[model samples]
Target: NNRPTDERIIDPSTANTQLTGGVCYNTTSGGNKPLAGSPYGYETWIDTGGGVCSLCWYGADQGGGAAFKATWTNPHDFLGRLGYFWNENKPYSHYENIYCGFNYTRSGRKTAGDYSYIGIYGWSRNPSASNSNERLIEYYIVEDWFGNQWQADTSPMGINTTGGTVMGSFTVDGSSYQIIKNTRVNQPSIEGDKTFVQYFSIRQSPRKSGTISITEHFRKWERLGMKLGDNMYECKFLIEAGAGEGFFDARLIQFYRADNEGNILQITPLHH
Candidate 1:
């Protein structure tokens, strides 16, 4: 069933179409799990070894657009968001417009933070003949974060990763960012726990929302020698909190692609 005023959900999801207009009633206990696809084939990539959290899915609309909200109370090793999952295995250049319009308000900030990372999160994989270390890459176009004492907050930030190399710096969507590359040896990946490179474009200044030009960052990273895999995994608005009781809500979050003639276009969701 569809609604007259629900978000224009031209996308597909296992969740009922009637579920629009109201929030998704799904809740998560502890563990790494992605709920059955939400509107636009989006899923909450939730992972908390302990504690409970609630995730809500609002519909896509012609005017109000779509929204996803999450609340977590004291979750351990937390990481979650409602976003698109893809296995296109294509390069960043494969799509002309890999972007999202995003904005959010997050509360429950901690005074001392370990590694609180929040913003546009996703993964890409090359899996070339090269050694395992340079195959898969986890990329983050970081917009905001929580607390202090986190290495990324300091000059020359580090993420307990291999190399922790500050590859370079660039600006996109009217904000400056630090480009850093790190490797996770035998870490968790889409294929399982494996070695991968983590690419980050940490915003020099923190903000709540704006247009996230994903393709722009990838183009820059590649120019900086931060290679990407051929496989395009998942691109989602994510929050990986260190240790805290917090909540985040994303409003008007929409993803679109570009046509060959350079016209930006809204799209149907792809479930891969």
Candidate 2:
């Protein structure tokens, strides 16, 4: 149950009192709702064959300034992937304040594969200053898996609004993987369309299996102008950082490398 703290006060607006303090806003409308519904409601459908697991959920914008967080029942048991939906005409949706975060518990391992990072992504319509509707950005994150007390590195940056098609790549142990991202904004980020969704997608490398493995958190990125795939500039290396053991271990690693790097200095192009 969420309540107002002494430092903050609630101003009566309707039957619902307005609240403020070390807190932001409070409401039970969609508080702790399950990640399952329809295109209109958030719901979950599993595809065991593809090893793809996903969930969806939605709620009315209770007007507490839009922000939320959730803890999955078996988060550590899965690869831990995430994503959401957004648009402009989705009445009641906050096109500018669409923010989110993904957290994974460490599976008692100190390897790089046990760490986690976040990235930004978007859709691709082409190159236009004001049209970044096609790009994905993945920002590295800090956590115990990275060997930091309080995870010294604690900041994430990426476009939090818009949608589109995008791509990226990374590699580990002499193997390479290309990551592609895109989105269809059939709806906008409105109260009715306040539907954020995500699922688990696996990556298969050229070789069947090996000690090298990486898990990627692919997503979409967009703003008023400019867009690029999460790996638009192409990452020299893409490592899988997540907690795991038994059924919770990474199933695959997606590695990507730029075709031309030394020829150009700090040169990042959307397309090779």
Candidate 3:
């Protein structure tokens, strides 16, 4: 709600700490919101060395994957910007209106970025074609991240920039979120390989923007059963970067539904 700064800013508590492997909430029915992403649909790329990324959409009566912009250097994973999701899974009463918004602004000068994250990525599918009922789920609602995040990158996610084990915590809009459920036994998803489940809601502190009432995080991941599949894949508004140099400037991005939520529309940046 006014965190867009410039001038090579980089002070995320210089990579804050106090994190453990799971659940902890000391009063924050406020609302807060991390990662394991990129790979469901609506793609983009950057990959490294002065990286760059972009996304802009509007069609289907105005509601496709909206804005994006990115930059990276040692970014072996994130590389650069990304956006445009809207895959359409239907169910949950077909989205029950909608809500997901953002606003960002970051400049270069990371020098050795290790992990990164942005919000609302998606995937889900439990309508089993009977591959032993291999449900597929990859979710995240992380708000932002950078520099040795994951408390020093253990190995839960070796290159995906680790941040796992923490299965509870809540609050939405004001902040306080830390729910994790990691597992990717067979790797690459969307029903190709096998073994799935990657749902996280990390956002203890760190902000670039707000407003993501996305079905109250799918009813708080179905109250921990963490079961969301019946197809609904590709739910956009993402940005991931690991092992990197840095540069991101997404002043603002937008997605809408709730009776148009007072007509939410964003995609601005023409030399602000």
Candidate 4:
């Protein structure tokens, strides 16, 4: 039950200490995997071995509370990129605001494609069926690749334009972003069938590290006629890598949320 706190030095070769909360590695890459933890607590899923795509994920379900935060470091060297996040999975009506703070350093290259983005992922479900294709939404807090900060507004794809929904460029909390909406079929969810419309507000520039005002963004989306999904679940921050090479260092100084009674709730991964 002894865990490293703060950002202590870790040697990947000497110790597999970084593997926790069901941490796993993959040799091949393709599609997204089911979230690697219980829907009610902390869980992590990672893919950073000899594969086409390299990724690392750390998540905490905060539906039972108000916030989640942490500090962690990335692998020393790898073929793909690494990232961290805080996620929530619950009904849309059950959704609440969030705030996150952290510090990270980016130093690496993309052997092939675009670099990784730090941000949040939100999904909505169909009211009629828990297994129906639900709606999806996301926001990229920052972009990083070999020190070149990529702006999300320049590209109108996932963060800019998806299908017919073209989100205008906007700025909030001193950061630039692109809003997007789209639908994908057959995506998986914990409670139902996995397909749904998607919305996003991807940050144009990297925020190497800072505090995010999640509640403010929700209010902004509401003003843009963005409809809240019948179900709101899956809120997370992550670093996704394409077939390339790079490394990042993240320190989660604090990650926790408050209850309705105003009691602060902190998160720790459950060990089986």
Candidate 5:
């Protein structure tokens, strides 16, 4: 099987990197959590003789702004996908503008996922802050996926609690998408008492590989009355896999943050 050079070489158990799991609900799916003693980063999870999923990171967990780059390959026809992410754990006005840009290449499957996508992933605080009442909003800015199609999802925990509703739709970069939103009541958070509302802007057309801007889409949503909290935290690029099994390769050529007007800001590259 052709695995990415970086992924193939790194030992998840001793990589000394930032690898995370249980951020959402996939932790409780009983699909075997990240192997014990594996915290360095760049780890893979496999079931039966196939079914592989790998994750890696290069940055602080507290969240800030950072650039990311990674090379990967998948040989098994089984279903799997990968992408790089940047997370910023900060607070701001719901009307504040945030922007991101990056270049990507496709090496494996031109189709990408069976029912999956490669896009930006992260969470925003609710406009109204609550004390000891852990509540936040999760959202996604989907860029591409299988069949060059698009859709949005919202869940209570992460994977299993699907109850997303399509609030509306919008177009960006010549691509159209549906705005899907959902809420999870009484979920757990880092604070203590917590709940979450999930938001997604799924692209309706195919954006297989190329340069894309995340900021412009944010502006479009705001115009449609999608209220993102003032402070945006844990901003990241993510690859989500559905039931179909296959491999896709992605490289984060460059990444950075921008202001509402799409002006690049001073962003620190992730610390290796």
Candidate 6:
């Protein structure tokens, strides 16, 4: 059944503070394994510059029409990179590393239904990785080095122990290992900390090419645990840059919610 309702797009002048940026947690249940004294950390914030401020509702899949981004920096080591851990979104829990000397485009999508896929594109490193030293410029989806990686920026952009060839390896802090993984999309967040910046580009299904829409749903769990069908906000869209290198000037398009009953919205403006 269809209604002639115009997906009440949000007003650009009004900023909704009620909806904070979207954040997700790794389901590892807090295992205290000591990491390799990594001296690199970063700050993340939504550069809603020239884009939509629409909120994401419902499912956590790529669609729902919202995309965010962050920049990672390592002070001491150029080898200092970022590795995002997988969240059932990929196989065998892999990871991806964005090295010091390249620009990365991490984009995702969720459809009118729930079909989703997150990807990496327009990634480049100074010198490409070979079999012996592949971990040098590769992307993985886990913190552990034994996952999978993608060195070349092309289709099937990632490779892991189960999918593709096992290339080169590296050992930092005396632990020699030989696998690389693509960075995962799920990330960690602090409840009161507003400094976390997460980044991902967003694009809708070209298959359903038309305008976008948004509607959010929320289910309150007094205990606050993650479970499927556990309702939350949902949003999605394709990003477009007006005129800038690497679409830094791209405007974001998204759908949002006014309340839970599938009452939806959309947002896209020259400034947000």
User: What is candidate 1's local distance difference test score?
Assistant: 0.63
- Kindly give the number of clashing pairs for every candidate: 7, 53, 17, 26, 23, 48
Local lDDT at 125 for model 6: 23
User: Which candidate's TM-score is highest?
Assistant: 1
Of 2 and 5, which scores higher on TM-score?
5
lDDT per residue for candidate 4 within 125-144, as digits (tens), equals: 44654434333443333433
lDDT of 6 by residue, 1-272 (tens): 12223333322223222232433211221321111322111112223332222212212222222323321121110011111222223211011111111111332221111111222211112122233222112221121111112222122222322233333443322233233222322333222222221222122111111222111000111112111121111111222222112211111223332222323222221124
- The full ranking of all candidates by TM-score, starting with the best, is 1, 4, 5, 3, 2, 6
- Expressed as tens digits, the lDDT of each residue in 132-189 for candidate 3 is 3337778877776654643432212222454456778798877777778777787766
lDDT of each: 0.63, 0.23, 0.52, 0.41, 0.43, 0.21
RMSD of each: 7.6, 18.4, 17.6, 9.7, 11.5, 18.8
Model 5, runs deviating above 4 Å: 1-51, 56-115, 127-134, 147-163, 185-194, 259-263, 267-272
Q: Candidate 2, residue 140: CA error in Å?
A: 6.5
Of the two candidates 3 and 5, the one with more favorable TM-score, higher being better, is: 5
User: Which whole-number lDDT from 0 to 100 does residue 90 have in model 2?
Assistant: 29
Candidate 2 Cα misplacement greater than 4 A, ranges: 1-79, 87-94, 101-105, 108-115, 118-272
For candidate 2, the lDDT comes to 0.23
Candidate 5 clash figure, as a count: 23
Deviation (Å) of 211 in candidate 4: 0.7
Decide which is better by TM-score, 1 or 3: 1
